[PDB]
């Protein structure tokens, strides 16, 4: 497992460890690409639509925390399609 | 001008006006600095010299956000950004 995720009714959160500049994150529509030092963390399509402009991330110690707001307030069964 | 800044020999201070409670987003990684206020970019650049990113702190004083970070080296900076 390269990452974990959790959700609030209106938001998705993704976490992964900093190895060890390096952090590249792009969302276009539902497509999501997260790389860390060239290694792919996630390369897929989110289950539902998000507000791509709301995308934010920070580093807390050894962990990167990524947050994006959902378009629709509903629980997601999974992160990706 | 979206912000102002000043310095001590060992510290950088950045100020900008407010507009709750996820409105203020601040990230520094290495020398890269991103400050957003209600989604609007305040700063998006690279600091002139290295700072201790762990020392980064900010607070709201009335209508003004004050950001402080400690310089790695004790020297005057000609500019805030590269």
TrEMBL record, chain B:
Keywords: Cytoplasm
Keyword Cell membrane set for record: no
Predominant location category: cytoplasm
GO cellular component, one term: cytoplasm
CS domain segment(s): 1-81
Location in the cell: Cytoplasm
GO function terms (MF aspect): unfolded protein binding
GO biological process: protein folding
Name of the molecule in the record: NUCLEAR MOVEMENT PROTEIN
Residues of the full protein shown: 5 to 89 of 131
